[PDB]
Design a protein around this ligand. Sequence first.
Ligand code: CLA
Ligand code: CLA
Ligand code: CLA
Ligand code: CLA
Ligand code: CLA
Ligand SMILES: CC(=O)O[C@H]1CC(C)(C)C(=C=C/C(C)=C/C=C/C(C)=C/C=C/C=C(C)/C=C/C=C(\C)C(=O)C[C@@]23O[C@]2(C)C[C@@H](O)CC3(C)C)[C@](C)(O)C1
Ligand SMILES: CC(=O)O[C@H]1CC(C)(C)C(=C=C/C(C)=C/C=C/C(C)=C/C=C/C=C(C)/C=C/C=C(\C)C(=O)C[C@@]23O[C@]2(C)C[C@@H](O)CC3(C)C)[C@](C)(O)C1
Ligand SMILES: CC(=O)O[C@H]1CC(C)(C)C(=C=C/C(C)=C/C=C/C(C)=C/C=C/C=C(C)/C=C/C=C(\C)C(=O)C[C@@]23O[C@]2(C)C[C@@H](O)CC3(C)C)[C@](C)(O)C1
Ligand SMILES: CCCCCCCCCCCCO[C@@H]1O[C@H](CO)[C@@H](O[C@H]2O[C@H](CO)[C@@H](O)[C@H](O)[C@H]2O)[C@H](O)[C@H]1O
Lengths: 174, 173, 188, 208, 211
Amino acid sequence: KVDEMPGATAPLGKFDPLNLATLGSESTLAWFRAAELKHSRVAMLATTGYLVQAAGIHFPGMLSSDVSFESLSAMKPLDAWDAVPEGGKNQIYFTIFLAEFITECKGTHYTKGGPLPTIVFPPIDFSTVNPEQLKTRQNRELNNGRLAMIAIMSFVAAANIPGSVPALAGNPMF
Amino acid sequence: LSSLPGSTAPVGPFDPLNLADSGSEETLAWFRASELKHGRVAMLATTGYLVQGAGIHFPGMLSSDVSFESLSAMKPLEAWDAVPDAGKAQILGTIFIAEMITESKPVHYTKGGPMPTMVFPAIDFSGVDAATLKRKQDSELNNGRLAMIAIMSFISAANIPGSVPALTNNPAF
Amino acid sequence: EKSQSLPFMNRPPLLDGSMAGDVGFDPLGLSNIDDVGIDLYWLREAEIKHCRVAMLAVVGILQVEIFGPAPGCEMATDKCQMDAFWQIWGAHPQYIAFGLIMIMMIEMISGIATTQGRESGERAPGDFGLDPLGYGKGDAAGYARLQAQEIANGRLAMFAAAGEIMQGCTTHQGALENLMTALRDNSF
Amino acid sequence: KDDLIAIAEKSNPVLKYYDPLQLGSTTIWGETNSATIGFLRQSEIKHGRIAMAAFVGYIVQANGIHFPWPMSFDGTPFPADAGSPPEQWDALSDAAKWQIILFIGFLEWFSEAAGKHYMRGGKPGAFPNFSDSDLIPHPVPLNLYDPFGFSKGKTEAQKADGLIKELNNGRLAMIGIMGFLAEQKVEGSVPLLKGVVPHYDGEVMAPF
Amino acid sequence: KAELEAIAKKANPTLGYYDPLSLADKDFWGKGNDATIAFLRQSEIKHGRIAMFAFVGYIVQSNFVFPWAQTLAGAPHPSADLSPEAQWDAIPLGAKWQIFAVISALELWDECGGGGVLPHYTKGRKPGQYPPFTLFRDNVHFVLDLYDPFGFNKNMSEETKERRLVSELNNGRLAMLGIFGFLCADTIPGSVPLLNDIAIPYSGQVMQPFE
Ligand code: CLA
Ligand code: CLA
Ligand code: CLA
Ligand code: CLA
Ligand code: CLA
Ligand SMILES: CC(=O)O[C@H]1CC(C)(C)C(=C=C/C(C)=C/C=C/C(C)=C/C=C/C=C(C)/C=C/C=C(\C)C(=O)C[C@@]23O[C@]2(C)C[C@@H](O)CC3(C)C)[C@](C)(O)C1
Ligand SMILES: CC(=O)O[C@H]1CC(C)(C)C(=C=C/C(C)=C/C=C/C(C)=C/C=C/C=C(C)/C=C/C=C(\C)C(=O)C[C@@]23O[C@]2(C)C[C@@H](O)CC3(C)C)[C@](C)(O)C1
Ligand SMILES: CC(=O)O[C@H]1CC(C)(C)C(=C=C/C(C)=C/C=C/C(C)=C/C=C/C=C(C)/C=C/C=C(\C)C(=O)C[C@@]23O[C@]2(C)C[C@@H](O)CC3(C)C)[C@](C)(O)C1
Ligand SMILES: CCCCCCCCCCCCO[C@@H]1O[C@H](CO)[C@@H](O[C@H]2O[C@H](CO)[C@@H](O)[C@H](O)[C@H]2O)[C@H](O)[C@H]1O
């Protein structure tokens, strides 16, 4: 199935030096593609959410009744999450849970012969029906998400160990 | 199953523990009527907590010595305690007739018959356009499913503060 | 064939749904007794007499505890009818003894009608021919409904009259204020 | 049911048949659907007919229209000295109210007992004339619908169109008289009647 | 679906047919694709023809008002304040409900189909076409038609309207962001011109008394 799926690009054709695609069944690979894409979409929102919170741009004007948006724009984005109120993080953890509960319980699961998780709300999903154009588009989602997976690990290797990256660690935000 | 009403768009049919096949067809028919009755009771319970929790109350006297002024002054879960014993005897008595009548229909809903319809006033609802009644049965169950979570949240907020983040500093709780 | 009331048990063989309240409820097999002057005829006559005595006893309690005793008996004044008997016996004991000997002649005649009605076949159990309004003349389906309604209200009143004796002889209050006591004690 | 759609199409060619609740397809007392659809037609016509006499009767009794002569044995005229016509129903008497209610209650009775009923072969709203049906022993001179005879000679198509503009003037006066009495108990309830209506503030939905 | 792509052959052959979100093959409310492709066509026709109705409502409402009465209370206008976006609040609230009553009735006549004279746009009718008032005019009183109340057009040949339908939504979508170059030019503005306008109610859509 690893020949018939997106992710195969021109620099590395089918990059699998440990042969972990054919290690399990097709449900194991279908779990792996659903976990590469979910790690892609989180890290793509993570790389964007680090850069637009290190650039200083923020919402107006008060996040809570006590916590402003501008007080979290001054600190680093990895330390701004510690200052989000506990009722606000519970609002985030509830909608994330209710999206994970829905995508794993929508019919014909992805580990079976089913689709990968789509938009929970609102359900449209914007997908092109042209399979020659859509296959390149989801080839573009993966390696942009692959680069964003390395990028957000570079953002936490610059905020924990001073150094570790040449074009960062001179910046009071990363 | 999906031809049944309560199957909807986001999760339909939602049954991860496969409880629908734990019994026979008559067990599922008992499960549907119990979900429908848990829904209708909780929708009256979520609204009865929201209305009496604000201060909306009837004008005048509930009994000879208990007005609605004193019951709205309390939180609703202990407002039931100051209702007179002849007041709960009147409420529980008409529910007893309502539960006896909807059970004593000529075919039981466990055996394929009708689910509990209105007793007093006994408006007929049979030929009310099965396509429109299909959508409205889904909105009865979905509003029942949400209100059952809601009234269980209201009791949990009234005794364990901080159980729900949206009702922490609420004065009705 | 299984009993209707106890579907794990076989049907008792002398009960075949001919009598009014027959749903096969004889687990102890007491309808099979045929020895010490007692058979299914005697038990049905005993059931029907226990039905009718207990039916009159319930409304006989609920008449006095609502509307008071009859005139000539206003010396009662107690809602507990197990205690109000002894105030009528304390003042006008002759009318109770008038009724108790009038019952004694009626019951000894009814005891002859039971045993002669059993040896012959011209008397149903509990039948005395007391149909003066004549409900039994037409609509045998509607007459069997009255035979079942007598048994159904009589079996219910047997528990009620036995209870009002026992919860009158133990609480010394009366049936309707035992009912109000229980309503305020077990209210939720 | 087939004729109820044909009636409402003539009342509005845009809104042909309007039924959100689908109340037109129910029974009430287990009669049939076609017999209760004459009950619903009668009750709509009776609601609109009462409300349209109530709307005229409001604007007469809200202004100062107290007509001579007062018909009593002591005095006690028509109690327009409050004025405010929901207050003026309270200030009649207690015993005068049963004379008004029971007289309408005969006309409610006579529309049920006499010539033909709306939960049968229908024509709802058709009040039976007092001349026929042989139940009243007086007899009385006039009828309720045509006392002076105006106007016999109108064709069927001239009177079939009458109920359709009686139903539409009856539906509007249901909204009309209720917009007055809503401002008698809550102001701002209708937006264009602020300040006109004097806030009766009692209970309009109780006689005594 | 194919008739949508035929309009893009006539709209801009340099760019061409262009859906980035690929909404031309989706379905909304489970009502199918061919109803979805006509909801999308009617929505941007109604978005454009409102924006072109507001683009000319932004260039003369700044510069020229009629001065007469405006109300039965004196102060006989909102007293421009030539910034047009800010003239809406003090109009007052009683006038905004009358505007929101006719547009509630005008858009109720559009999705009606004129009492059933025309079909519905999801089920067959041309999407820009407003149903005429010919069935209301036949019954109640003389009302003028919404599109052409006087009968100036219907002199055209048939091939000219489809070359003007394609000119309409092409002029429509430019005025969609054209009118959004004005009220976005009043809250952290962002443009080369500078100078047009300044105010800060910023949107949405009623003001100080409600909710
Ligand atoms: C961690 C999330 C994750 C997951 C679940 C996958 C899963 C997959 N990748 Mg992807 N990949 C990832 C991250 C991931 N990748 C990243 C970050 C890059 C950029 C380096 C890539 C670059 C890449 C290419 C170029 C290709 C794939 C392909 C595949 C598929 C091949 C099957 C396989 O061998 O599974 C992998 C099995 C796993 C269990 C996931 C790996 C997790 C390891 C075992 C954990 C240990 C890693 C270790 C800590 C090193 C990380 C260092 C870190 C600090 C940066 C499979 C769906 C191929 C494909 O799509 O074919 C169509 C393919 O050609 N991947
Ligand atoms: C009174 C409780 C109750 C009962 C009897 C039912 C019964 C049913 N539901 Mg419903 N449901 C409920 C509550 C209930 N539901 C609530 C509160 C929600 C919102 C979360 C839902 C959401 C839901 C959806 C989306 C669907 C159903 C469906 C069904 C049918 C599934 C078949 C089955 O056999 O499951 C039997 C179910 C039970 C025996 C439930 C009993 C309770 C269990 C044993 C323990 C639950 C404890 C729980 C963990 C505590 C959580 C607290 C809560 C406040 C969150 C069945 C008629 C499906 C349907 O309608 O198809 C026709 C369907 O698609 N349910
Ligand atoms: C302003 C709002 C308003 C509305 C919405 C209505 C609507 C209605 N009224 Mg009307 N009514 C109004 C103003 C209004 N009215 C005013 C201002 C008066 C005073 C003049 C009346 C006096 C009036 C009378 C005398 C009657 C109605 C009836 C009706 C119903 C006719 C359709 C029907 O039969 O459905 C079916 C009915 C319902 C859906 C209502 C359900 C009522 C429930 C079940 C409670 C029943 C309680 C009742 C007292 C029980 C008595 C018998 C019992 C003791 C055994 C309809 C619901 C008629 C009716 O309901 O007959 C069946 C009727 O007889 N109305
Ligand atoms: C189990 C039946 C029963 C018994 C033991 C009693 C006993 C009593 N009643 Mg009560 N009562 C009863 C039923 C009964 N009643 C019924 C059914 C009613 C009507 C609802 C009443 C209404 C009532 C009132 C209003 C009052 C009493 C009072 C009394 C007390 C004094 C009366 C008396 O001694 O009369 C003496 C007995 C007689 C005059 C004759 C008895 C009847 C004879 C035996 C005929 C029986 C025929 C039989 C029923 C059917 C035919 C049998 C056969 C042919 C098959 C006494 C303790 C009074 C009291 O003091 O209260 C504290 C009082 O005021 N009773
Ligand atoms: C790939 C490049 C490309 C191609 C091949 C086309 C092709 C077309 N365009 Mg498109 N368009 C393009 C890019 C392109 N456009 C760009 C970059 C823009 C943004 C400027 C537009 C905006 C646009 C609009 C708004 C319209 C078109 C229209 C057209 C069609 C007819 C144009 C014509 O020749 O009419 C002849 C040209 C005229 C008659 C000029 C009209 C001038 C108007 C009436 C006044 C404009 C104001 C003026 C500039 C200044 C007035 C004075 C001022 C100081 C007050 C033609 C298919 C039209 C259409 O779709 O109809 C079929 C149409 O309405 N285009
Ligand atoms: C044919 C026809 O036309 O009819 C048809 C069609 C038609 C018209 C579409 C219909 C409809 C749709 C309807 C009527 C929809 C309405 C739905 C409705 C009525 C939804 C209420 C939500 C309120 C909430 C969630 C409150 C939260 C409140 C909370 C959480 C509080 O804390 C309350 C509060 O007091 C306290 C407790 C504490 C205070 O510290 C705070 C305040 C003061 C706030 C019909 C009638 O069905 C049928
Ligand atoms: C968005 C949508 O879908 O909407 C749907 C929703 C829904 C609900 C499903 C539908 C419906 C049915 C509706 C709207 C029913 C409402 C009917 C309504 C509003 C009915 C009032 C009648 C007034 C009466 C009977 C009596 C007045 C009483 C009078 C005239 C009197 O007795 C006399 C009096 O006045 C005077 C003369 C003189 C005074 O001295 C004394 C008083 C004051 C006492 C529709 C039609 O489908 C529309
Ligand atoms: C951004 C910008 O530039 O704009 C500026 C300028 C401007 C123009 C001033 C703006 C504005 C004003 C706007 C846009 C105002 C809102 C407009 C809008 C769109 C308002 C929807 C109403 C929907 C209703 C009432 C639904 C009824 C529906 C009902 C009652 C039902 O569903 C039930 C029913 O039908 C069925 C389903 C079944 C039947 O059995 C029964 C019936 C018939 C009862 C802004 C936003 O302020 C700022
Ligand atoms: C289809 C997707 C469905 C997603 C559903 C998501 C529903 C989200 C509902 C969120 C409602 C938030 O409700 C809100 O909770 C916050 C806490 O966060 C409360 O906030 C209150 O308590 C918190 C502590 O708990 C304090 O820090 C805060 O200062 C105080 O105002 C508000 O009193 C309440 O109004």
